């Protein structure tokens, strides 16, 4: 797979282009100093594209810092979007524009020269042309229109275009450069997941209109009909233009080079008002309220074989979707993040949703772990300050997503599709919690964080688990959607899994949170009152494997007069409770099943109540008697809804843990506090 270095990749256009790149088979690495963006776009892209996107928070002007990228990955090509681009502001702080824009480019190019990277796609701008009307018949603007920027920003782009040409000319066989003159990019990815998030005050017609329609701006000011003209290009069409440029460079010989420029525009001139109207039409709202700059797009069409395919209307609808779904952009009140590994390692973060409220949930990319749950300011689960603790080799699987298969598998073996598999044995004579392939140590993509409604926050993570990398068969795609309802103090966990390749895989995920409802006071779970839905449980042998029988455990149920009180030492549980002793488990996806209340836990000293519910057939209950790795025995209790023990080897339970090609595994767990 070709690796493309995308500078300024967390920004607007760059982010959209990453989508196209990944979709076209390229792998991307993003380098961005976040001067006009946040990492959130990148995190969202991971999920949207179903690919990890290595990210470097770096200023291109920092040679040492940028060199690491070239040392860490074999870069095949670079698309350079990084830069300052506010024309207005450029007139005011020209030195910063030139320093940032020119120096960043030169450093990047010097490293490429050094690392022998020859392919470069540059974000130029129609601003290089200046006022084309200074010439006759220059509208629409051809690539050949003489350059003459009229603002510092344009000046910087013009300088960069010359550096490129000069550089190619200096070693014609070692450089393949595509200079792309963008016109006015507008719009958002149709999914509504990413868009332009102007960190400050929209300088642009569009983002500014949008901020108005959403009350972020009181009113918008309109600055042939009366209105200055532009060529509004859908950011998706623009992004695709980059893929066309890359292929063009790719057509050239290893031994050959080139330097050429292309306008990337629709060729359609738009009347500000015309836009307004398109927008108002799109948003269903009435906002308040150089001559021309239209591209001649013939060269790109003929040479790059590219042309816009979307309309201003599409740009408007798409922008409107992104806007309505994210009125305030990526940054959200009630959402906070911190590093959980090395400074600046963005894919190693602890993100808290419901931050500053009576119900705060922290999740980690690592194991899509539930790092903490705070109810009324009090933490109710066990966890570690950083990834280091989670990564202990003597794991108790605290707060983790367990996958692909929770609990025990007899002797680590199973057969499927008439093929016999052997998993690494790690617990007694069996493989527990999928041993070496445990999700608890795997790093998930994302997250995508939303605040869809008052008091509601969501976090979605994804995991790509390829056959080639595990003892299990098949390429599995997993998604985890966490929904935090602050008003109800509830956490909903929805698992989905699907094979992208392979005939089938055993699957049985869960969350291994360990609760402790009395942290402020108290060295153990002692004092906790427990009641479960029913005593019916999976009978097991000396090796924790099912005997085939179903027996009662001695524990309180919801109808008992008194609850089971957990003492400092006893009672001790480590068993699988059955929801319906009758049930003939047939479903790979329980998402539409009833959300059954399975466990009630209460601590009289903190007065907190926890209820766990699940659409799953069984639930493991464990008193943390064997708690290690930083904790001691009985410091927390686990409740893991799922599918029996060794189901894969059990005649009557195997189908419900067998994910076949074409189907979707689904499971839901809910924790509610009161």
Ligand X SMILES: NC(=O)c1ccc[n+]([C@@H]2O[C@H](COP(=O)([O-])OP(=O)(O)OC[C@H]3O[C@@H](n4cnc5c(N)ncnc54)[C@H](O)[C@@H]3O)[C@@H](O)[C@H]2O)c1
Ligand Y SMILES: O=c1ccn([C@@H]2O[C@H](COP(=O)(O)OP(=O)(O)O[C@H]3O[C@H](CO)[C@@H](O)[C@H](O)[C@H]3O)[C@@H](O)[C@H]2O)c(=O)[nH]1
Ligand Z SMILES: OC[C@H]1O[C@@H](O)[C@H](O)[C@@H](O)[C@H]1O
Instruction: Give contact residues for ligand Z (rule: CB under 6 A).
Output: 396-397, 407, 432, 574, 620, 622, 626, 640
The strand pairing partners of 370, in sequence order, are: 363
Neighbours of 216 (CB within 10 A): 16
Number of H helices, E strands in the chain: 13, 39
Q: Does 85 bind ligand Y (CB under 6 A)?
A: yes
Annotated binding-site residue? 14: yes
Q: Which residue's CB is nearer to ligand Z, number 340 or number 623?
A: 623
Which of 217, 230, 404, 408 is the binder for ligand Y (CB under 6 A)? 230
Q: Does 223 bind ligand Y (CB under 6 A)?
A: yes
Nearest residue (CB) to ligand Z, 472 versus 644: 644
Q: Angle CA(596)–CA(601)–CA(607) in degrees, nearest 5?
A: 130
Q: Interface with a second copy includes 103 (CB under 8 A)?
A: yes
> Shortest distance, CB of residue 180 to ligand Y, whole angstroms?
11
Q: Is 384 annotated as a binding residue?
A: no
Q: Confirm or reject binding of residue 87 to ligand Y (CB under 6 A).
A: yes
* CB-based burial label for 319 (10 Å; 0-12, 13-18, 19+): buried
326 touches Na ion by CB under 5 A: yes
Among 450, 479, 589, 667, binds Na ion (CB under 5 A): 450
Stretch that binds ligand Y, among 182-190, 418-426, 450-458, 569-577 (CB under 6 A): 182-190
Give 161 or 475: the residue with its C-beta nearer to ligand Y: 161
Question: Is residue 335 within the footprint of Na ion (CB under 5 A)?
Answer: yes
Q: Of the candidates 13, 3, 10, which has an alpha carbon nearest to the alpha carbon of residue 78?
A: 3
Binding mask 272-291 for ligand Y (x = CB under 6 A): x-------------------
| Residue 80 appears among annotated catalytic residues | no
Residues 38-97 that bind a second copy (CB under 8 A): 90-95
- Residue 510: C-alpha distances to residues 33, 101, 135, 302, 496 (Å): 37, 49, 68, 54, 11
Q: Which is nearer to Na ion, 325 or 663 (CB)?
A: 325
Residue pair 355/334 in contact by the 8 Å Cβ criterion: yes
Is residue 153 marked as binding?
A: no
CB–CB of 478/469 below 8 Å? no
Output 175 or 208, the one with its CB closest to ligand Y. Answer: 208
Query: Is 34 labelled a binding residue?
Result: yes
Which residue blocks in 477-623 are alpha helix, DSSP H?
none
Over the window 168 to 207, marking each residue x when it contacts a second copy by CB under 8 A and - when it does not, the resulting string is -xx-------------------------------------
Residue tagged active-site, from 51, 80, 189, 512: 512
Q: How far apart are CA 501 and CA 408, in angstroms?
A: 25
Contact 620, 576 (CB under 8 A): yes
- What are the strands, taking DSSP E only, across 287-354? 335-339, 349-353
In 3-state terms, what secondary structure has residue 71? helix
Cβ neighbours around 253 below 10 Å, total: 8
Is 549 one of the annotated binding-site residues?
no
* From ligand Y, Na ion, a second copy, none, interface partner of 547 (C-beta below 5 to 8 A by class): none
Stretch that binds a second copy, among 99-107, 246-254, 415-423, 473-481 (CB under 8 A): 99-107
Q: Which does 619 bind (CB under 5 to 8 A by kind): ligand Y, ligand Z, Na ion, none?
A: none
Tell how strand 335-339 and strand 349-353 pair up.
antiparallel
Q: Is 11 annotated as a binding residue?
A: yes
Binding to Na ion by residue 485, rule CB under 5 A? no
Q: Which residue is nearest to ligand X (CB)?
A: 11
Question: Rule CB under 6 A: which residues touch ligand X?
Answer: 7-8, 10-14, 32-37, 59-61, 81-85, 100, 104, 123, 125, 182, 184-185
Residue 93 binding partner per list ligand Y, ligand Z, a second copy, none, with a CB distance cut-off of 5 to 8 Å that depends on partner kind: a second copy
The secondary structure element, H or E, covering residue 240 is helix 235-251
Query: Per rule CB under 6 A, is residue 536 in the interface with ligand Y?
Result: no
Which secondary structure element, helix H or strand E, spans residue 505, and what is its range? Answer: strand 504-506
CA distance 614 to 592: 11
205 belongs to the binding site for ligand Y (CB under 6 A)? yes
Q: How many CB atoms lie within 10 A of CB 193?
A: 20
DSSP category for residue 591: T
**Residue 64 or 562 having the CB closest to ligand X:** 64
| Secondary structure, 3-state, 250-291 | HHCCCCCCEEEEEEECCCCCEEHHHHHHHHHHHHCCCCCCCC
Report whether the peptide linkage leading into residue 404 is cis, meaning its omega lies within 30 degrees of zero: yes
Residue 315's Cα: distance from chain center in Å? 24
Cis amide leading into 58 (omega within 30): no
Annotated binding residue 4 = yes
SS3 487: coil
Stretch that binds a second copy, among 167-175, 253-261, 454-462, 528-536 (CB under 8 A): 167-175
Nearest CA to 80 among 8, 168, 3, 17? 8
Round to whole Å and give the CA distance between 487 and 541.
44
- Is residue 378 a contact point for ligand Y (CB under 6 A)? no
Q: Which of 33, 105, 151, 184 touches ligand Y (CB under 6 A)?
A: 184
Question: What values do phi and psi take at 482, rounded to 5?
Answer: -100, 135
Instruction: Report if residue 292 touches ligand Y, rule: CB under 6 A.
Output: no
Region of 44-52, 162-170, 242-250, 556-564 interacting with a second copy (CB under 8 A): 162-170
Q: Which residue has the tokens 């976090």?
A: 459
Q: Give min distance, CB of 319 to ligand Y, in A.
A: 12
Two tokens at 366? Answer: 């690592």
Q: Which residues lie near Na ion (CB under 5 A)? A: 325-326, 332, 335, 450
Residues annotated as binding site for NAD(+)? Answer: 3-34
Active site residues: 512
Q: Which residues lie near a second copy (CB under 8 A)? A: 90-95, 98-99, 102-103, 106, 109-110, 113, 152, 155, 159, 162-163, 166-167, 169-170
């Amino acid at each position: 797979s070709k690796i493309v270095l995308v500078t300024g990749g967390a920004g607007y256009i760059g982010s959209h282009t990453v989508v196209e790149l990944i979709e076209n088979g390229y792998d991307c690495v993003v380098a961005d100093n976040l001067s006009n963006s946040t990492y959130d776009s990148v995190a969202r892209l991971e999920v949207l594209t179903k690919h990890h996107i290595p990210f470097y928070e770096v200023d291109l002007c920092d040679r040492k810092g940028l060199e690491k990228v070239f040392k860490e990955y074999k870069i095949d090509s670079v698309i350079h979007f990084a830069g300052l681009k506010a024309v207005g502001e450029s007139t005011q702080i020209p030195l910063r524009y030139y320093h940032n824009n020119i120096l960043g480019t030169v450093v990047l190019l010097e490293l490429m020269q050094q690392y022998n990277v020859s392919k470069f796609v540059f974000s130029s701008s129609a601003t290089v042309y200046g006022d084309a009307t200074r010439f006759p018949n220059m509208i629409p603007i051809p690539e050949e229109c003489p350059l003459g920027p009229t603002n510092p920003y344009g000046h910087t782009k013009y300088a960069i275009e010359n550096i490129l040409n000069d550089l190619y000319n200096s070693d014609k066989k070692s450089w393949k450069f595509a200079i792309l003159r963008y016109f006015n990019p507008i719009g958002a990815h149709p999914s509504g997941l990413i868009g332009e998030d102007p960190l400050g005050i929209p300088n642009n017609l569009l983002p500014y209109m949008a901020q108005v329609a959403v009350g972020r701006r009181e009113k918008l000011y309109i600055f042939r009909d009366g209105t200055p003209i532009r060529d509004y290009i859908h950011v998706v069409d623009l992004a695709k233009g980059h893929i066309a440029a890359l292929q063009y460079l790719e057509a050239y010989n290893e031994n050959e080079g080139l330097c050429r420029e292309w306008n990337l525009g629709s060729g359609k001139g738009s009347t500000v008002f015309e836009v307004y109207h398109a927008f108002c039409k799109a948003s269903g709202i009435d906002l308040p309220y150089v001559l021309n700059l239209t591209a001649k797009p013939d060269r790109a069409k003929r040479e790059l074989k590219w042309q816009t395919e979307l309309q201003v209307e599409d740009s408007c609808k798409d922008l409107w979707k992104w806007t309505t779904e994210n009125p305030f952009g990526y940054q959200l009140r009630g959402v906070e993040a911190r590093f959980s590994a090395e400074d600046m390692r963005y894919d190693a973060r602890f993100v808290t949703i419901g931050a500053g409220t009576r119900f705060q949930a922290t999740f980690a990319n690592l194991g899509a772990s539930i790092v903490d749950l705070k109810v009324n300011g009090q933490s109710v689960v066990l966890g570690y300050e950083n990834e280091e603790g989670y990564l202990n080799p003597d794991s108790a699987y605290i707060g983790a997503t367990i996958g692909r298969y929770a609990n025990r598998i007899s002797k680590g073996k199973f057969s499927l599709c008439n093929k016999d598999y052997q998993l690494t044995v790690n617990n007694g004579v069996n493989a527990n919690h999928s041993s070496i392939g445990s999700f608890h140590r795997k790093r998930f993509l994302g997250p995508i964080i939303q605040n869809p409604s008052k008091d509601v926050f969501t976090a979605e993570y994804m995991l790509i688990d390829n056959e080639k990398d595990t003892e299990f068969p098949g390429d599995l795609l997993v998604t985890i959607q966490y929904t935090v309802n602050v008003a109800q103090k509830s956490l909903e966990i929805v698992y989905k899994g699907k094979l992208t390749a392979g005939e089938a895989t055993p699957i049985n995920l869960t969350n291994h949170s360990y609760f402790n409802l009395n942290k402020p006071y108290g060295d153990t779970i002692e004092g906790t009152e427990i009641m479960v839905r029913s005593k019916k449980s999976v009978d097991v042998d000396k090796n924790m494997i099912p005997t085939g029988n179903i027996v009662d455990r001695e524990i309180a149920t919801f109808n008992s007069t008194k609850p089971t009180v957990l003492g400092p030492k006893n009672p001790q549980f480590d068993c699988c409770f059955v929801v319906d002793e009758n049930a003939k488990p047939s479903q790979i996806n329980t998402l539409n099943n009833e959300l059954t209340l399975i466990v009630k836990a209460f601590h009289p000293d903190s007065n907190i109540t926890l209820e766990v519910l699940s659409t799953e057939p069984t639930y493991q209950f464990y008193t943390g008697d064997f708690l290690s790795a930083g904790y001691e025995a009985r410091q927390g209790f686990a409740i893991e809804p799922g599918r029996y023990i060794d189901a894969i080897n059990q005649e009557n339970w195997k189908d419900c843990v067998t994910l076949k090609n074409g189907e979707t595994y689904g499971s839901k767990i809910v924790y509610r506090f009161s």
